[PDB]
Structure 1
Amino acid sequence: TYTTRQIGAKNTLEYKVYIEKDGKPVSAFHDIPLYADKENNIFNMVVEIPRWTNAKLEITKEETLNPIIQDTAKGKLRFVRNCFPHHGYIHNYGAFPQTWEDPNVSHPETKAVGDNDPIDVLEIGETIAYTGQVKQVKALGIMALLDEGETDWKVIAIDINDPLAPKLNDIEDVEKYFPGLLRATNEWFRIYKIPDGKPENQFAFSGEAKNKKYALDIIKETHDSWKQLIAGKSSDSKGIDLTNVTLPDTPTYSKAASDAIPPASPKADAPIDKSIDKWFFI
């Protein structure tokens, strides 16, 4: 049983969300198994941002036990802007634990280094997720996003408890039941940061969403990359905090990291500035 420990009021600089393992804080990047069912390829996804929300909550690499915190830019809370016809994030967005997009290396398909973070998952179920929630999903395909020149693969997946779960098994089913969702995913990731001064993103494979096989090859590679990492054999760890509480053969393993963590102090959500409302017509 994975739960959540909320410290602070959502939408504040102070807001932290730690994942708990049967009541004890674990590392959201390290102590949560990639696979819930390896045989079958059922993955564990850590949800960072709920669908149609704007706060840019992220699993923080350099904090101990990598809590999910809102990203900041120039001292301020970061929020993604609404770009017509979309309203915030159009997917439940998060990542697969125990994966690492090697910054030190130029993945051969996209020809650019990874973006230094857990691989990214777009979860397309019909229920809006919650922050710090662990969900079991099935990968259906993958997109090669080059986000600011950096390899940043987007894995398309679905909550296995989703009513259509059974009917979706490969990328081509995405278009049969969620027609146009895959083209909106291409357009959303090309332009979301334009209202921020960033250039427009680009996709490898001409925006081709790769199938479950290819995707599965990519999650493994990334998962192997994390293996070199938490083990201690990465060429450059970039100062990621490797503290964990469940991999005992690791240099960085450390029980008591968990007792170290402060109790939940959940507070009512802080309000978001009315500028976030703005709808951009890009």
Structure 2
Amino acid sequence: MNPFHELEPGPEVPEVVYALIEIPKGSRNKYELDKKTGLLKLDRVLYSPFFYPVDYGIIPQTWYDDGDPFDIMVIMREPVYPLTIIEARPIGIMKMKDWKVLAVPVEDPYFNDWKDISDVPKAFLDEIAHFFQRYKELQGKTTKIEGWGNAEEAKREILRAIEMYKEKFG
């Protein structure tokens, strides 16, 4: 089974979710999942020499307004491998509806005091937004980053996404 379907959204939803990582921090290769099997698949090589600034993936058993799993960005000191599960605490949301959750690992004590969007250095939020603003520029795509929402908003959206998945897939 594709792990997107097999894994639960999290152990204490929405305060703690599972993040199924597709793309380790530092990658220029953009990975996704094969729909039928759930094997890792190369979506594309980014057209610019940019790298993912976060460990990037999806929350299992979620679906969202834009017709795809709900994306999640986990701040990790040492990247994980693709297809690794991280227990993640949502701390905010990037408003790109194609919004993406920002989260920290529960089990890295470095981040113990990161509980809301105000705990993240502004330069780091700017770097993440800039990456999503420009990484597909050479593919003729544009995106506006509207801004960042707080942890409460992120959690509300996670609950919506958990419900949408149950509705679409049963």
Task: Give the TM-score taking structure 2 as reference length.
Answer: 0.92
Question: Equivalent residue for 1:36?
Answer: 11
Question: Equivalent residue for 2:78?
Answer: 127
Equivalent position amino acid for 1:183 in 2 = D
| 8 Å contact from structure 1 (residues 49, 93) kept in 2 | yes
Question: Equivalent residue for 1:173?
Answer: 119
Provide Cα deviations, 1:121-147, integer angstroms capped at 9, x if missing partner: 1111211111111111100000111xx
Provide Cα deviations, 1:222-274, integer angstroms capped at 9, x if missing partner: 1100011111xxxxxxxxxxxxxxxxxxxxxxxxxxxxxxxxxxxxxxxxxxx
| 8 Å contact from structure 1 (residues 141, 170) kept in 2 | yes
Equivalent position amino acid for 2:28 in 1 = N
SS in 1 for 2:112: helix
Q: Cα–Cα, structure 1 residues 159 and 81, in superposed 2: closer, same or farther, change >3 Å?
A: farther
Question: Equivalent residue for 1:214?
Answer: 153
Q: Which runs of 5+ in 1 are unaligned?
A: 1-25, 72-77, 103-113, 146-150, 232-282
SS in 1 for 2:138: helix
Q: Which has the larger radius of gyration?
A: 1
Question: Equivalent residue for 1:194?
Answer: 137
Percent identical pairs in the alignment equals 29
Give the whole-Å Cα distance in 2 for the aligned partners of 1:81 and 1:202: 19
How many residue pairs are counted as aligned between the two chains? 170
Question: Equivalent residue for 1:242?
Answer: none
Task: Give the TM-score taking structure 1 as reference length.
Answer: 0.57
Provide Cα deviations, 1:46-66, integer angstroms capped at 9, x if missing partner: 0001111112111233x24x3
The residue correspondences of 1:82-121 to structure 2 (distance < 5 A) are 82-83=48-49, 87-102=50-65, 114=66, 116-121=67-72
More helix by share: 2
Q: Which runs of 5+ in 2 are unaligned?
A: none
Give the whole-Å Cα distance in 2 for the aligned partners of 1:68 and 1:90: 19
Question: Where has structure 1 moved over 3 Å in runs of 4 or more?
Answer: none
Equivalent position amino acid for 1:184 in 2 = E
Equivalent position amino acid for 2:10 in 1 = Y
SS in 2 for 1:139: strand
Question: Equivalent residue for 1:164?
Answer: 110
